[PDB]
Design a protein around this ligand. Structure first.
Ligand code: NAG
Lengths: 198, 212, 225, 219, 214
């Protein structure tokens, strides 16, 4: 607990990661002012589990984690405990006992292109579901059958990543959304991230 | 408690049509209303939550709307596997309550039944009872008339019918009728027949066997 | 990978009690509420109550208050629903249902999310004085397309499960709903249509399971000669 | 019940397009792939091309690359094959095929096939068939039905709504120089059943939407 | 492309023997990317073998597959009458996924004499102004048969059409239907209608005839 935690770096970053390669910022030894988050009206999703956001300035934690990525709007519902889908199963999984906040806002003006933004990708094939907070960035050919693929595309041998190709669509559910997930860790250790009141 | 009145109780429509069922609450329940689809014999499966949100994995053909007291649930392109009973459920105030349900049926082209007849097994004859089974396979519409004839004598009071739910693939039904007699009564007669009357048959179709 | 697996179908005498279990796997058991919902045969759905899997606090619907007890065992990740003074109206399929977690919105308000995303397979509880009876399985021998089947007769209570060739055969299979005979015993038939040419080549066996009596019967059905 | 079901037969004028559907059931569609193959009458199988359901990536044979478009609709678990610039050489039966898949695992070969869709491309119009009885004369007798003056292929013929199948022979149709098709479907039955048992031939022509039930009596 | 040559073009064997079908590729193809299909008349291809040695689900043991590199073999031991079909090999490891030309497997049988039947045109068809006479040849082997239409002892030519079915899956026989088409006027000008069947199983040609109006 010393200087202020750099939340604006996470939220106002020029570029966001692909969901399959989601970014994580580890926040330690600072004073965290969450008022800039829960007093803003720009967010379309703001859901906290195990904690109320209006109390965050009065709480202390061992560490805080800020995960950021981009997904489709109709996929934001999958960033929640117990959910399923391509994002939750193969790209970014929250734990059942999650303590934190999920914050998402429409980023069509930033991440959409008339010709499509193909810099943003998601994992489409995987042998098994991701464990909570697991990151998988491999590009190995997915083996759909029992025949080894030998790193070559073909029948039952598919590239595992697929691009969103974000465009300025008509339905908001198809547009890109930027997501920040705040995780509040509590261990048997001194607290290093505290709200200004503490 | 808050009572949820669903309408209609049941309905039928052809493949491809748009279907809109409604759920009305006794009091104000905001938008905390959910829609489940229960296929025959299985647990209800959530399709719409909070009156408009499509559950992950649900096809886009399903939709919902409403806030307050009146709610609607809509299927855009009716599909063969949409055959189920649909329930609305509120959680604005305990206790949680469900609607009365809406049984959705599918219209298709008329298909004639295939009729088979089964004499009693010798093993069952050992027990002192005879069961004759008449099977109608893969027909539409549901209505059919199965008439048992023993030596051309029309039988009533000694048979029971059971009809399957609509098949999720071909939208047809199947029916089984069982005629039960004692071995003494069974051995007393020769010709056992079941007669089937259906919209898909110009004339009734009889399948019979002789006990010999 | 979430699974809610419930205990088997049971018959109980009137005035007695039944305890239905629901074993949970694939998720952190203590992180979710567990609800119980029952369905009488051919009727609608009825909410019974809710239990906190963490601390075991419960809240029951008024019409079941004093008659239902909901418990949880964190060691076995199991939730139990116990209903006493059983009457005929209590004959129903009982379900454990799991909704997602609740959450706080931007304003700090607690928001509930009681829509049931997971269900158990259900448990049929029959309230009757009649005694359990195992079924008898008889062949329905066959004759294009032929048809064969198995007749499952004189059992109590519901249900029985019929598979064909240990699950290898599913196409053309119709397992008809049971009928309550005048003798108070249930009876159903399971039929399947097959190609005629396969009559002399492929072997057909029906496997019938009446769990409430621990009855497993394998019946080979062959054309009569 | 695991099946692939295709759309019914199609008649299309030359130069137009045909869209064949292929609906999947019993399978994890999202992990599978669908290949489309064509077979001309009395000919070999011809590979058209395949699609990966999850990604939509397609790969076509050189002959169909500029003319075929294969898509899928995951909300209905239905794949589609569209053929454009239809010429008389495209008259054939078109099959879709897919491997069975358990969620993530898939079978290592195309083991599920559709029934096929007969597509005829020609300038002639669609004409319903006329059905005439070939009555048996007066220890085994023979009867049948004559299905005359229809276009295009195929026609389906059953007897007693499928109850009678032993001894039946439905001959392949012959195109009578007028440009319409003629076919005969016969069956042999014992000579003691003409005056007692009734025989009806059921003919269906899907391209003209004609269902006929003709009883055959001995003169 | 990869060229798939199947050998031989046609295969005639008696039931109970062992059939050997060869499939050759212009270049090497991975074994786990070669398949054998069996297609019966009026039926879709059925996956027989995949991976060049693995049987699809529910396929009998009398079907076997082997081979590697540029040569693959499908062997049908204990040949059965229902195995008459066209068997195809397909490679699907390199685009385009080419097929073989197919091998026609036919069943040998004892010589069988056809049963000859005649059907005069129905009155319903006469009212339409066209007459069709059908001669049916039932359950004969081999395929080679000769049908001659005679009207008032006059041999007809250029006005009859024949149609032969595929080999039966049970008795391995063939069936033929010959249709003679005339106008109302031409049909009513003549009296006696006969079709003459010449076949190996008949010592002398068999004529089946009817008299118009009797
Ligand atoms: C991002 O920038 C906007 C405008 O400059 C500001 O209102 C907002 O508070 C910033 N976000 C954070 C987390 O500081």
């Amino acid at each position: 607990i010393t200087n202020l935690c750099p939340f604006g770096e996470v939220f106002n970053a020029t570029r966001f990661a692909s969901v399959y390669a989601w970014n994580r910022k580890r926040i330690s030894n600072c004073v965290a002012d969450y008022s800039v988050l829960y007093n803003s009206a720009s967010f379309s999703t703001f859901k906290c589990y195990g904690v109320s956001p209006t109390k965050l300035n009065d709480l202390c934690f061992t560490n805080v984690y800020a995960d950021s990525f981009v997904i489709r709007g109709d996929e934001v519902r999958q960033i929640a405990p117990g959910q399923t889908g391509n994002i939750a199963d193969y790209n970014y999984k929250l734990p059942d006992d999650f303590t934190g906040c999920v914050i998402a806002w429409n980023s069509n003006n930033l991440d959409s292109k008339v010709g499509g933004n193909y810099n943003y990708l998601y994992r489409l094939f995987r042998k098994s579901n991701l464990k909570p907070f697991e990151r998988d960035i491999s590009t190995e050919i997915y083996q759909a059958g029992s025949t080894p693929c030998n790193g070559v595309k073909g029948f039952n041998c598919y590239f595992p990543l697929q691009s969103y190709g974000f465009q300025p669509t008509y339905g908001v559910g198809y547009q890109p959304y930027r997501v920040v997930v705040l995780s509040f860790e509590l261990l048997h250790a001194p607290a290093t991230v505290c709200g200004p009141k503490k | 408690d808050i009572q949820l009145t669903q309408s209609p109780s049941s309905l039928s429509a052809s493949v491809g049509d748009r279907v809109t069922i409604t759920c009305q609450a006794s009091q104000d329940i905001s938008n905390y209303l959910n829609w489940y689809q229960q296929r025959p014999g299985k647990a209800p499966k959530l399709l719409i939550y909070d009156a408009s949100n499509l559950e992950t994995g649900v096809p886009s053909r399903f939709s919902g709307s409403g806030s307050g007291t009146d709610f609607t649930f809509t299927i855009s392109s009716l599909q063969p596997e949409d055959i189920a009973t649909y329930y609305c459920q509120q959680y604005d105030n305990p206790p949680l309550t469900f609607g009365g349900g809406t049984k959705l049926e599918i219209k298709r082209t008329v298909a004639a039944p295939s009729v088979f007849i089964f004499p009693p097994s010798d093993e069952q004859l050992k027990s002192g009872t005879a069961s004759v089974v008449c099977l109608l396979n893969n027909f539409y519409p549901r209505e059919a008339k199965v008439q048992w004839k023993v030596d051309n004598a029309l039988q009533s009071g000694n048979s029971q019918e059971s009809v399957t739910e609509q098949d999720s693939k071909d939208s047809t039904y199947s029916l089984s009728s069982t005629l039960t007699l004692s071995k003494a009564d069974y051995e007393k007669h020769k010709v056992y027949a079941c007669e089937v009357t259906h919209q898909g048959l110009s004339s009734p179709v009889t399948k019979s066997f002789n006990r010999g | 990978q979430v699974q809610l697996v419930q205990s088997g179908a049971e018959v109980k005498k009137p005035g007695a009690s039944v305890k239905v279990s629901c074993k949970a796997s694939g998720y952190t058991f203590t992180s979710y509420y567990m609800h119980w919902v029952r369905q009488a045969p051919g009727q609608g759905l009825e909410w019974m109550g809710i239990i906190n899997s963490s601390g075991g606090s419960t809240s029951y619907a008024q019409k079941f208050q004093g008659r239902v007890t909901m418990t949880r065992d964190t060691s076995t990740s199991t939730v139990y629903m116990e209903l006493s003074s059983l009457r005929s109206e209590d004959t129903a399929v009982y379900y454990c249902a799991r909704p997602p977690r609740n959450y706080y919105d931007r304003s700090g308000y607690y928001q509930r999310a009681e829509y049931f995303q997971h269900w158990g397979q259900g448990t049929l509880v029959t309230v009757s004085s009649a005694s359990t009876k195992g079924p008898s399985v008889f062949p329905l021998a066959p004759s294009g397309t032929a048809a064969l089947g198995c007749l499952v007769k004189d059992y109590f209570p519901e249900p029985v499960t019929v598979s064909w060739n240990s699950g290898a055969l599913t196409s053309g299979v119709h397992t008809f709903p049971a009928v309550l005979q005048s003798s108070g015993l249930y009876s159903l038939s399971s039929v399947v249509t097959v190609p005629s040419s396969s009559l002399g080549t492929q072997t057909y066996i029906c496997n019938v399971n009446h769990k409430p009596s621990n009855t497993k019967v394998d019946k080979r059905v062959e054309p009569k000669s």
